[PDB]
Amino acid sequence: IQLWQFLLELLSDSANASCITWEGTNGEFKMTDPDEVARRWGERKSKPNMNYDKLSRALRYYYDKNIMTKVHGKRYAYKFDAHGIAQALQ
Amino acid sequence: GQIQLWQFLLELLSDSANASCITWEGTNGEFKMTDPDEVARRWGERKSKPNMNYDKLSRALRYYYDKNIMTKVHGKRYAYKFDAHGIAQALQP
DNA sequence: GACCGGAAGGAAGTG
DNA sequence: CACTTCCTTCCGGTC
Ligand SMILES: [Ca+2]
Ligand SMILES: [Ca+2]
Ligand SMILES: [Ca+2]
Ligand SMILES: [Ca+2]
Ligand SMILES: [Ca+2]
Known part of the structure; x- marks a missing residue:
């Protein structure tokens, strides 16, 4: 699994807004809890x-x-x- | 295709027309990529x-x-x- | 502190 | 094989 896949996986479920969320419509997102995103990315790999x-x-x-x-x-x-x-899906 | 990166770099380095993106520096085999993205592009183009x-x-x-x-x-x-x-050694079968 | 990007090298895929 | 791909790890530098 690619990091870009995993982030889209978190961003697709609103229940993760506590650690990561969309912000606007143009694909902008923000990590509301970066340490939590990192911890989960670590647990995945x-x-x-x-x-x-x-x-x-x-x-x-x-x-x-x-x-x-x-x-x-x-x-x-x-x-x-x-x-x-x-570009990610080429 | 078929060509190897070390050969492709020696090709460029032999022709100092390519000096804008890669050139020799010392006399002892040292070289610098002055435009690394340009060297990558041509390498991509080639292969x-x-x-x-x-x-x-x-x-x-x-x-x-x-x-x-x-x-x-x-x-x-x-x-x-x-x-x-x-x-x-890279040259040998 | 974020953020940046060079450099090393692990590991899996390709053709 | 000889890369290619995608990182993980570390780190000196800027802001
Ligand atoms: Ca660049
Ligand atoms: Ca500081
Ligand atoms: Ca860059
Ligand atoms: Ca640092
Ligand atoms: Ca630092």
Whole structure:
């Protein structure tokens, strides 16, 4: 499983809004609890030392592939739009 | 296709018309990629692999360390050093 | 503190 | 095989 798949899995269920949520309609999302997202991403890949420094590095590798971009100035905010998902499913 | 990354890099490096994206630096086999995204693109172009980027190219170069084909120029951005002895073995069947 | 991106190397897939 | 792909881990730097 890719990180971008797992994040869309969390974002699709409103019950995870406590740790991660959509914000707008254009694919912008925010991690309301980054440490909780990281902890769950770690539990998924059997990576119990996973944290936000490491998970965000994984997100940063998506910039060059046009898969997502940073919401400049918004704490824990990135953009995963329809262009982005199209690139992820190639 | 068929071609290997170390050959493709030697091809570019031999022609100093490519100096804008990759050139020799020392006299001892050291080279720097002045435009790493451009080197990745052409490598992608060559191998019909259109999602190629420095992250994936540099990972390929990192596999050459244990093959004695090249080494990292430590503390110098996008800089590597070819080994004439390693190139020679890479050349053999 | 976020955020950035270089560099190392593990691990699985490809063709 | 010889990469390709996608990270995980670490870290020095900017802001
Ligand atoms: Ca980049
Ligand atoms: Ca770049
Ligand atoms: Ca500080
Ligand atoms: Ca740090
Ligand atoms: Ca620091």
